[PDB]
Amino acid sequence: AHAFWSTQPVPQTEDETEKIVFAGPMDEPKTVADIPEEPYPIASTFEWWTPNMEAADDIHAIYELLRDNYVEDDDSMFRFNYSEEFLQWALCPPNYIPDWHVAVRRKADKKLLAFIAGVPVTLRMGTPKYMKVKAQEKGEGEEAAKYDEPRHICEINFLCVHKQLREKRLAPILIKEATRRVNRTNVWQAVYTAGVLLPTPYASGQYFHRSLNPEKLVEIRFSGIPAQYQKFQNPMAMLKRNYQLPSAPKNSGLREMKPSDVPQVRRILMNYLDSFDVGPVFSDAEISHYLLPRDGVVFTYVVENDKKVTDFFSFYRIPSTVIGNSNYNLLNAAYVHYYAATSIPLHQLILDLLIVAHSRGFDVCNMVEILDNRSFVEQLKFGAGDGHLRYYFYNWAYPKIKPSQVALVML
Ligand SMILES: CCCCCCCCCCCCCC(=O)SCCNC(=O)CCNC(=O)[C@H](O)C(C)(C)COP(=O)(O)OP(=O)(O)OC[C@H]1O[C@@H](n2cnc3c(N)ncnc32)[C@H](O)[C@@H]1OP(=O)(O)O
Ligand SMILES: O=C1CS[C@@H](c2ccccn2)N1c1cccc(Cl)c1
């Protein structure tokens, strides 16, 4: 039963999202003027805080709250350790709204106890092409297309409540207050993902992992040593051999992206993402922000031939704290970010991603089965991991789609 989510304009059952065919809002139309100008009441001991994302110490404070209290695996062996530079990058894209970053502090000592972040995204989120066609066949195209235009909405990430404060109903309050701030900005939809099942996802996809340093991975117990490896003389030598990668990329004219590549990367990205039902639209400034290489944060390479960019890939780094273990502090994971291929099969392009990642010291490469990510799983030796990433809209009815129809990558 859901005391909070039942009060919210989201689909309430799996049933509701099977019956849905057109995109559009769920709630009553409202106006900025309908929305309370004052922050949601919270207890006397606490206060609403808007971190300054240009302040190293506000960034640090958020960093600490996530380092100690953010998402762990089911066995409390690992916890994400997003870096400060990653958080400045993710929290401050072009035209970000400082007010959408919502925090609760203890008034006495200014200890950060809870956080959620919103950032702008321009999202295509109209009726999927299929439902759009089924709609003509039944005479209802204008209705199916009403919301085809890309929409400036809020993307929510980094909801975190201090472990000492869990199950005190603080997360509802953070969400109501984020919602109020976003609504005051005249934005009525949001997009979010979670590893947990909430009401009600529009898409769900498994995670996949590709071992790059399997000895470390087994050592920290991220990976097992499969049963067929027993019947073998020296387990690890077989495993390392199985996962070994070339030292240098195979595509000649792969190089790191540079500022002048922005317009071309934009165009082959937009062309590719445009084929999916749900996907972001980026300006040049968003392309530079999200894809220009940044040290220990995002890593992007283009294939250029005859002075033209014809393919590119990117990945970002999130290290995970290894929670038990005396020998290892961190596990260094690369996450497949946006890419586009026009001159070579995707599997050949993403082999270079794995090669570069391995070459720079990453232990595993991770992704969700969105985009055409299923297309290279077998050949590059990715295996399905635990659990699923679920995709959600706030205040947006949307039919249930497959993850291969989603082109929004979450940080
Ligand atoms: C238009 C603008 C809209 C803007 C907002 C759009 C929506 C944004 C929504 C947020 C998108 C987040 C995207 C990400 O960042 S997903 C990552 C979420 N973060 C973590 O998992 C970090 C570790 N966990 C924690 O920090 C806490 O356990 C959290 C904060 C997750 C819950 O704190 P706590 O454990 O102390 O519980 P409570 O007593 O305060 O509250 C219990 C209520 O909270 C509902 N709950 C539990 N987990 C989640 C979850 N991941 N999303 C949404 N709701 C969740 C739960 O069903 C229950 O409601 P109800 O079942 O009683 O009805
Ligand atoms: O990349 C890593 C490093 S260890 C593990 C993990 C799980 C939960 C929280 C942090 N890290 N992990 C992982 C596993 C499954 C999904 C995701 Cl997004 C990350």
Which atom of ligand 1 sits closest to the CA of residue 2?
A: 63
Task: Using the mean position of ligand 2's atoms as its centre, give its distance from the Cα of residue 374 in Å.
Answer: 19
CA 180 – CA 188 distance, rounded (Å): 10
* Residues β-bridged to residue 47: 105
User: CA dihedral defined by 234, 238, 239, 242, rounded to 10 degrees?
Assistant: 180
Burial degree of 307 (CB within 10 A; 0-12, 13-18, 19+): exposed
Q: How was this structure determined?
A: X-ray
Q: Which ligand is nearest to the Cα of residue 322, counting in written order?
A: 2
| Ranges of H-type helices in 165-311 | 170-183, 214-219, 235-243, 262-273, 284-291
- On whether the CB atoms of residues 406 and 205 are closer than 8 A, the answer is yes
Look at residues 373, 354, 374 and name the one whose alpha carbon lies nearest to residue 362.
354
Q: What's the N-to-C CA distance of the chain in angstroms?
A: 29
Task: Using the mean position of ligand 1's atoms as its centre, give its distance from the Cα of residue 159 in Å.
Answer: 6
Is the C-beta atom of 341 inside 6 A of ligand 1?
Answer: no
| Ranges of H-type helices in 31-152 | 56-69, 84-91, 129-137, 141-145
**Is there a binding annotation on residue 161?**
yes
- On whether the CB atoms of residues 151 and 309 are closer than 8 A, the answer is no
CA 57 – CA 299 distance, rounded (Å): 26
Look at residues 370, 367, 336, 71 and name the one whose alpha carbon lies nearest to residue 202.
370
Active site residue 87: no
Q: Which ligand is nearest to the Cα of residue 7, counting in written order?
A: 1
- On whether the CB atoms of residues 408 and 279 are closer than 8 A, the answer is yes
What the chain holds in terms of domains, given with CATH numbers, is 1-411 (3.40.630.170)
Q: Residue 160: CB partners within 8 Å, gap ≥ 6?
A: 65, 66, 69, 70, 114, 115, 116
Task: Using the mean position of ligand 2's atoms as its centre, give its distance from the Cα of residue 78 in Å.
Answer: 7
